[PDB]
């Protein structure tokens, strides 16, 4: 096989060419030409056979994406792995290759107010599709959101998502850890498990934030400080929003806390677009359940040259439950794979 930076990467005849481009959670991502297509692509390794964890994050993704069609969400082209479960040690998706990632962009360029209403047009028309299948995503950040040359943006990563459950949602404080820390929503930290559609919409709202900045807007140092940047910019929560949460432990620790202002938004962003700062807000809504939803952030002033609802499609097939792969050990979820894999076998 071919080999990389002294890694297997076997990909070939089709693809050939590679060249590395970076890592995902289970192996390295290479650029490579597809001669079929006669277009280069994108290819990630996936070597999770060994963990039951690893297994569930990869199933997961293929079972989501094999369903999934939209112009906002990378797909799978390919799926390359050996002819037999006993031969079966990694697993290639092959996807569109893309120029860049939000996360990349924001390190070096200033985003135009035009470009910034595209972005966000673009990853909420994706996410709209998402939540509409019953399927929540879990892990938006900048680094998920890839560019090409034309600034097309596509939502990368499924592997952590989940199929929505607000009837199971509530649990205890200080013990959820739902998406990546900047991006969490502040009920993750004091009574939800991460299974309603509102914790995306927060995460959309903190890249937006970014996208206005160059810099996260609550960049906590460690779990337990992310709470500390959300109040001190959201300030104190009210009397109805403390009374829609039950849980003592939650409530006692706000209710224990000075007083803290809301930082206005236009002196966070004093350059921003006032219509983008209203939709701001009402992503980055304290409450969950007053937090805006998908369909209406569509229809918000600040999207209004790009709102076109019968251009903003929704899933044929939404997931009905959850997968239930939990409890299923690795070997079971190894045999999955190579079933959930075969379509794409010569
Ligand atoms: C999507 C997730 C990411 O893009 C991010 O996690 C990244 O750090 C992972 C490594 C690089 C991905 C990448 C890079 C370039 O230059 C072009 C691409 O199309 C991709 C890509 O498609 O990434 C997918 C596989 C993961």
């Not at 277009?39 to 999770?48: F, L, T």
């Not at 039951?52 to 082209?77: D, V």
Request: glycine share 4%; with cysteine; aromatic share 10%.
């Amino acid at each position: 096989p071919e080999m990389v930076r002294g890694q297997v990467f076997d990909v070939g005849p089709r693809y050939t060419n590679l060249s590395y481009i970076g890592e995902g959670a289970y192996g390295m991502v290479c650029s490579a030409y597809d001669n079929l297509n006669k277009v280069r692509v994108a290819i990630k390794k996936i070597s999770p056979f060994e963990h039951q964890t690893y297994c569930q994050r990869t199933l997961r993704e293929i079972k989501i994406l094999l369903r999934f069609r939209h112009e906002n969400i990378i797909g799978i082209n390919d799926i390359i792995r050996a002819p037999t479960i006993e031969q079966m040690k990694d697993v290639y998706i092959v996807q569109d290759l893309m120029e860049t990632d939000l996360y990349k962009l924001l390190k070096t360029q200033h985003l135009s107010n035009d470009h910034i209403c595209y972005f966000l047009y673009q990853i909420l028309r994706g996410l709209k599709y998402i939540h509409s299948a019953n399927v929540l995503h879990r892990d938006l950040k900048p680094s998920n959101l890839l560019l090409n040359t034309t600034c097309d943006l596509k939502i990368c990563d499924f592997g952590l998502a989940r199929v929505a459950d607000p009837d199971h949602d509530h649990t205890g404080f200080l013990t959820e850890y739902v998406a990546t820390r900047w991006y969490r929503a502040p009920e993750i930290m004091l009574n939800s498990k991460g299974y309603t559609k509102s914790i995306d919409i927060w995460s959309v709202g903190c890249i937006l934030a970014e996208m206005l900045s160059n810099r996260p807007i609550f960049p906590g140092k460690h779990y337990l400080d992310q709470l500390n940047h959300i109040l001190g910019i959201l300030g104190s929560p009210s009397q109805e929003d403390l009374n829609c949460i039950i849980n003592l432990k939650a409530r006692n620790y706000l209710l224990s806390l000075p007083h803290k202002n809301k930082v206005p938004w236009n002196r966070l962003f004093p350059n921003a677009d006032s219509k983008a700062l209203d939709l701001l807000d009402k992503m980055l809504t304290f409450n969950p359940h007053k937090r805006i939803e998908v369909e209406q952030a569509l229809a918000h002033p600040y999207l209004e040259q790009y709102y076109d609802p019968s251009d903003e499609p929704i899933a044929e097939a939404p997931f009905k439950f959850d997968m239930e792969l939990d409890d299923l050990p690795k070997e079971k979820l190894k045999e999955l794979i190579f079933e959930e894999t075969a379509r794409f076998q010569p």
